[PDB]
PDB file of C-alpha atoms in Angstrom:
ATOM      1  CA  UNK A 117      86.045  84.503  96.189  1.00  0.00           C
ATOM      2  CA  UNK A 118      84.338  86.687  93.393  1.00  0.00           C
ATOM      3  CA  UNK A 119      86.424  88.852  91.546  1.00  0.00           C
ATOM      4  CA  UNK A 120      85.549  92.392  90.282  1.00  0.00           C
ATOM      5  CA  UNK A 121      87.208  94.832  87.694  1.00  0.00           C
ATOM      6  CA  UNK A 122      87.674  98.029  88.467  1.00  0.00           C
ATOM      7  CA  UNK A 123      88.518 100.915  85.491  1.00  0.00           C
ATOM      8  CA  UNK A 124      89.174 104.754  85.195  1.00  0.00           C
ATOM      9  CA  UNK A 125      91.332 104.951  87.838  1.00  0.00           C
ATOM     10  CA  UNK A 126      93.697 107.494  87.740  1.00  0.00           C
ATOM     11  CA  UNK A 127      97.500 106.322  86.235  1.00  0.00           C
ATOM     12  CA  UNK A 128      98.979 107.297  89.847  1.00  0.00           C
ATOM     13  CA  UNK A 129      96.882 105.412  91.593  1.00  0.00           C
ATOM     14  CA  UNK A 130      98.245 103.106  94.023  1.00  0.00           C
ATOM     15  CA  UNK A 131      97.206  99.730  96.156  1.00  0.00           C
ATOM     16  CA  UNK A 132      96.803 101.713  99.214  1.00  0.00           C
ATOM     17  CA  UNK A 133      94.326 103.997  97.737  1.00  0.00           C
ATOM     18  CA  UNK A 134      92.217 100.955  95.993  1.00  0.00           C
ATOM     19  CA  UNK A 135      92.418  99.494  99.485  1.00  0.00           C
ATOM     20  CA  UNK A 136      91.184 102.926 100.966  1.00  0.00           C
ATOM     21  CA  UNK A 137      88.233 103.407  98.261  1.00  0.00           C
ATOM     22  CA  UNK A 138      87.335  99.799  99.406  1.00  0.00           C
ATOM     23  CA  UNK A 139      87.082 100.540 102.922  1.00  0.00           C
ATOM     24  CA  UNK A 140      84.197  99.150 104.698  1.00  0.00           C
ATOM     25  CA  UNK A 141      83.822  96.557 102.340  1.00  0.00           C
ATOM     26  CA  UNK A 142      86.335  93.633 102.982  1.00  0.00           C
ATOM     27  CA  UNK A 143      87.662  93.317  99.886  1.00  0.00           C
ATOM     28  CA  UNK A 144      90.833  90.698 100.301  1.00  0.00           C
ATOM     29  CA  UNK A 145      94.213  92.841 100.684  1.00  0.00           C
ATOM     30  CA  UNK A 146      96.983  90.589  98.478  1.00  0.00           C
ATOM     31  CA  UNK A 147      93.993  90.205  95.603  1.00  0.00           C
ATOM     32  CA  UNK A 148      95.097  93.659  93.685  1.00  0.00           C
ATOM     33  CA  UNK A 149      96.404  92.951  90.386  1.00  0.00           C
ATOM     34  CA  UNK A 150      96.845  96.278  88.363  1.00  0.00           C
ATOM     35  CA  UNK A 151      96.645  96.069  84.134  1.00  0.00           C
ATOM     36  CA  UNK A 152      99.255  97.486  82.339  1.00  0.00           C
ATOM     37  CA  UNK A 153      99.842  97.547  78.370  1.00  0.00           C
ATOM     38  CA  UNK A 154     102.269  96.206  76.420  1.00  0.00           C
ATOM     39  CA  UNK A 155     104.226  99.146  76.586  1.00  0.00           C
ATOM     40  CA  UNK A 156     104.943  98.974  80.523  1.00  0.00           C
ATOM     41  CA  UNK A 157     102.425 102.067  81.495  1.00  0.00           C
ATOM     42  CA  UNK A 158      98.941 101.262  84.151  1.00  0.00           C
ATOM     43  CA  UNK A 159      95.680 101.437  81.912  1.00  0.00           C
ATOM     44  CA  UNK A 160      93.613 102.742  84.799  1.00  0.00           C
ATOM     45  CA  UNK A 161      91.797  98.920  85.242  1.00  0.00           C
ATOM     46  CA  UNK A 162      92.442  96.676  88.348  1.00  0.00           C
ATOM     47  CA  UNK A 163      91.028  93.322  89.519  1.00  0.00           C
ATOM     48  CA  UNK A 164      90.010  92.996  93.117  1.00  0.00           C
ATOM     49  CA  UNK A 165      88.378  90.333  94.707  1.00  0.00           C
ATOM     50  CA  UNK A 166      86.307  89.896  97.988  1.00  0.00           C
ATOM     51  CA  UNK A 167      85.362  86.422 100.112  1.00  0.00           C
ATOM     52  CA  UNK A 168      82.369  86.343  98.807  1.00  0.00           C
ATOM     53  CA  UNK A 169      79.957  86.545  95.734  1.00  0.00           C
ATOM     54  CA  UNK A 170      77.125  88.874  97.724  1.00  0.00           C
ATOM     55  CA  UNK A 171      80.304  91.560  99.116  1.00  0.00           C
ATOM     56  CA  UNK A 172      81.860  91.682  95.615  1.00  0.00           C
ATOM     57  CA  UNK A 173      77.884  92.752  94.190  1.00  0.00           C
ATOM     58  CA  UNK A 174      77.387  95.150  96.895  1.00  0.00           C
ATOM     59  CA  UNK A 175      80.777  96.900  96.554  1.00  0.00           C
ATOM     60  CA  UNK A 176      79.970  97.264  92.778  1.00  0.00           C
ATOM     61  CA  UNK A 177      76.565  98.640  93.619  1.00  0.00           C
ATOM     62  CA  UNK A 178      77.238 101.228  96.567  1.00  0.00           C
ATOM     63  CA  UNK A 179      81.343 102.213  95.296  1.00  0.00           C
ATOM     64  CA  UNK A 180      80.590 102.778  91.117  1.00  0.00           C
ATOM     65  CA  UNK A 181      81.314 105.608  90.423  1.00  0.00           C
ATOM     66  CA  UNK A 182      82.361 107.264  93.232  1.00  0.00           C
ATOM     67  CA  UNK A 183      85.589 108.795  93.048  1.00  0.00           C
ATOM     68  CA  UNK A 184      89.575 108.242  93.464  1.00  0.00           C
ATOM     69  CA  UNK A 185      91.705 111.318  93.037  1.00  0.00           C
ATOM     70  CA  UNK A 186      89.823 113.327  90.261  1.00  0.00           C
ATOM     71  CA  UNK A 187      88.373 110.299  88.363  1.00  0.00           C
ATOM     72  CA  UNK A 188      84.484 108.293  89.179  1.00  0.00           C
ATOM     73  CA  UNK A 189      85.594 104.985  88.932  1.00  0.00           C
ATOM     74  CA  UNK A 190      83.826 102.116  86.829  1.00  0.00           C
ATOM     75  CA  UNK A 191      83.191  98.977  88.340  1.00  0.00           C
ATOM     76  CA  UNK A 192      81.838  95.692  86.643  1.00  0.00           C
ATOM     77  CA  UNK A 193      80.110  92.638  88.747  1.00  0.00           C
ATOM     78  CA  UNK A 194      81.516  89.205  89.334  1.00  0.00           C
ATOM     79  CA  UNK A 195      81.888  87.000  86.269  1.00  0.00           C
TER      80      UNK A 195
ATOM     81  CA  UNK B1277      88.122  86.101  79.043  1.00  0.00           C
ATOM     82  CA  UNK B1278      89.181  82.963  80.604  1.00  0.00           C
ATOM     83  CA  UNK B1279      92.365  84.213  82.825  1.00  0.00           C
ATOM     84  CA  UNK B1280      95.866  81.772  84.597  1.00  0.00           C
ATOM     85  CA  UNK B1281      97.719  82.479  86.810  1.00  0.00           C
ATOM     86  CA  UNK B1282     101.714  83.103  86.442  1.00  0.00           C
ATOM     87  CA  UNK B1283     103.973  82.687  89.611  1.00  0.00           C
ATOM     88  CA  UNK B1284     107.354  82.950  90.157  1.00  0.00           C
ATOM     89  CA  UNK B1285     108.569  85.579  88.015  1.00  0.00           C
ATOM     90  CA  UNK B1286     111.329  87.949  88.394  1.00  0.00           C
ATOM     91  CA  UNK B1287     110.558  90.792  90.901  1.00  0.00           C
ATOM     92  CA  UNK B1288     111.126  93.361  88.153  1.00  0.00           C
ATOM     93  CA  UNK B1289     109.494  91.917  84.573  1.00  0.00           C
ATOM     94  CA  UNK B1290     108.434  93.820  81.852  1.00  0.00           C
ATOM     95  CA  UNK B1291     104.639  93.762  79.799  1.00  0.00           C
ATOM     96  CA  UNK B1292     107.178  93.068  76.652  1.00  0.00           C
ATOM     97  CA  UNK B1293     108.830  90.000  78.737  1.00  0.00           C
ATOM     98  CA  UNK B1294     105.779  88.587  79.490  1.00  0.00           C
ATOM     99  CA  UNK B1295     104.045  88.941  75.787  1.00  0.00           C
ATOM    100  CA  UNK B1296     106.986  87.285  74.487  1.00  0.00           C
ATOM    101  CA  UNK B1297     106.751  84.026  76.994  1.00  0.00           C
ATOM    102  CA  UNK B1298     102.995  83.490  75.273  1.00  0.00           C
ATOM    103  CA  UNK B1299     104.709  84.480  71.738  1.00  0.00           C
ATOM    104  CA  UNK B1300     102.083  82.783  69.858  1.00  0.00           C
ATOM    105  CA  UNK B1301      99.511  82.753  72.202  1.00  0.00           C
ATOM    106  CA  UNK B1302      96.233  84.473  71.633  1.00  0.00           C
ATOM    107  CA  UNK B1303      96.824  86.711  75.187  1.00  0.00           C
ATOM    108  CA  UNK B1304      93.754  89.526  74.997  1.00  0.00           C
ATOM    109  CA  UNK B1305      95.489  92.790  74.622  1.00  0.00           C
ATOM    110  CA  UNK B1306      95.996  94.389  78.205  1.00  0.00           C
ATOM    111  CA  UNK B1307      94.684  92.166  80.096  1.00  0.00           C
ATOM    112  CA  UNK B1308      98.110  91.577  81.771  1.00  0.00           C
ATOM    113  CA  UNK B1309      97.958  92.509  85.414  1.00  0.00           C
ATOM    114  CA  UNK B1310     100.318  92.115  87.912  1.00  0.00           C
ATOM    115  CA  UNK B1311      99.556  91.224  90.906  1.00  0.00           C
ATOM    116  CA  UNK B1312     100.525  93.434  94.701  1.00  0.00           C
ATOM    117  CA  UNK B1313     100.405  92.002  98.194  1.00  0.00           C
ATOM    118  CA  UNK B1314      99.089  93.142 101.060  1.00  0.00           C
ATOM    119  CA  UNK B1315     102.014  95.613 102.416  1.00  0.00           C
ATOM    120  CA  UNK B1316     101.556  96.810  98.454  1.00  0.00           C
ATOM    121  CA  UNK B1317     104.744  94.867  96.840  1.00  0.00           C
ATOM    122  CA  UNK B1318     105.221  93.327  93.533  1.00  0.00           C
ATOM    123  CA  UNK B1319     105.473  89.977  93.633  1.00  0.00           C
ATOM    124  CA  UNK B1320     106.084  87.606  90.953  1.00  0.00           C
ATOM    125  CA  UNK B1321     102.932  87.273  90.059  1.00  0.00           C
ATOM    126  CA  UNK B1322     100.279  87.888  87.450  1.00  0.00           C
ATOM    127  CA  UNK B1323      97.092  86.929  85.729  1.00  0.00           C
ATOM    128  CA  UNK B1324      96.973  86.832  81.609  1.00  0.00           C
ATOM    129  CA  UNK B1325      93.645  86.488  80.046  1.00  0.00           C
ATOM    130  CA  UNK B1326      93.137  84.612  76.935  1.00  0.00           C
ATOM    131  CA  UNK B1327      90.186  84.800  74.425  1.00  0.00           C
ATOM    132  CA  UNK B1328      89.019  81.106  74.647  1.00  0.00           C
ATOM    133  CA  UNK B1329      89.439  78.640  77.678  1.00  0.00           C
ATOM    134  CA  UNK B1330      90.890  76.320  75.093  1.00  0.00           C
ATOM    135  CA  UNK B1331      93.811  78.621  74.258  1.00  0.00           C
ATOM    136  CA  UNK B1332      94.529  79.398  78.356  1.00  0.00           C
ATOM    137  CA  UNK B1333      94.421  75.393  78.336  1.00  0.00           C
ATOM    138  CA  UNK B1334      97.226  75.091  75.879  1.00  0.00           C
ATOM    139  CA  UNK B1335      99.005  77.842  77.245  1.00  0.00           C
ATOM    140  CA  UNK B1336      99.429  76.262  81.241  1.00  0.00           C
ATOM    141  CA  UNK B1337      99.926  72.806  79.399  1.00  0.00           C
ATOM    142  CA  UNK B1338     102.375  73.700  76.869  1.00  0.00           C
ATOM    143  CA  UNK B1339     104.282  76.921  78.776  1.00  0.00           C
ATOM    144  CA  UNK B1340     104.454  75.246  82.653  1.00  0.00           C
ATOM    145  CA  UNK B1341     107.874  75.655  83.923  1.00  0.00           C
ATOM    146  CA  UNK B1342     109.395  77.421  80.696  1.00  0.00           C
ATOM    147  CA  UNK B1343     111.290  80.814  82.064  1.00  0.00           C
ATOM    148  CA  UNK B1344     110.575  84.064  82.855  1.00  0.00           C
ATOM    149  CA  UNK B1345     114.308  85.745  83.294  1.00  0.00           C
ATOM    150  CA  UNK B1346     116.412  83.327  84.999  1.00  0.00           C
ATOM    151  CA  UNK B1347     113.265  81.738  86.814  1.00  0.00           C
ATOM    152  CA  UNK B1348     111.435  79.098  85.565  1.00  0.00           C
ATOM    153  CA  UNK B1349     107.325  79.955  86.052  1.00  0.00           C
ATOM    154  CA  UNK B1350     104.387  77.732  87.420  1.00  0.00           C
ATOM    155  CA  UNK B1351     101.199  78.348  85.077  1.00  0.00           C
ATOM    156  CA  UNK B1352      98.160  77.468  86.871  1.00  0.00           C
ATOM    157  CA  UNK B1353      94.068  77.844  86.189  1.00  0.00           C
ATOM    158  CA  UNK B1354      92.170  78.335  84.675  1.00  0.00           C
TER     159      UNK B1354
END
């Protein structure tokens, strides 16, 4: 399971919608985690994960920066 | 950048609450992110990321099973 970050999104954005912008690319449903500061408030970066190391490298080819709301989101390769 | 696991936390927990479990711990500024299930829910859960994997280490040894609200929290990873 290869795990991906995911930044820019917008500070509405919800787990349905990361789900959504994954669609197509079988990212693993419960894997969302969403970052948050130390002040309680989203900072636009997520962590999803996918079964394996070659789907988590494709999504972060085809899906950066394509949009979610009004925002291209940023997304980093497996580490 | 070496991340644990935290389970068993309070549905409703704040950043602050967390921060102050790893008081002392080197935890890389917002790097806290909890963690949804599938139907979207919080859950208890989160992953904190620390700076060296010798820090995270110390952290899951000297932190397991301290609490977290009234709930005493499993540390795991990395």
């Amino acid at each position: 399971p290869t795990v991906i970050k995911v930044q820019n999104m917008p500070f509405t954005v919800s787990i349905d919608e990361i789900l959504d912008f994954f669609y197509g690319y079988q990212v693993i449903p419960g894997s969302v985690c969403l970052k948050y500061n130390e002040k309680g408030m989203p900072t636009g970066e997520a962590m999803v994960a996918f079964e394996s190391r070659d789907e988590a490298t494709a999504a972060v080819i085809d899906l950066n920066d394509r949009p979610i709301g009004s925002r291209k989101v940023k997304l980093s390769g497996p580490s």
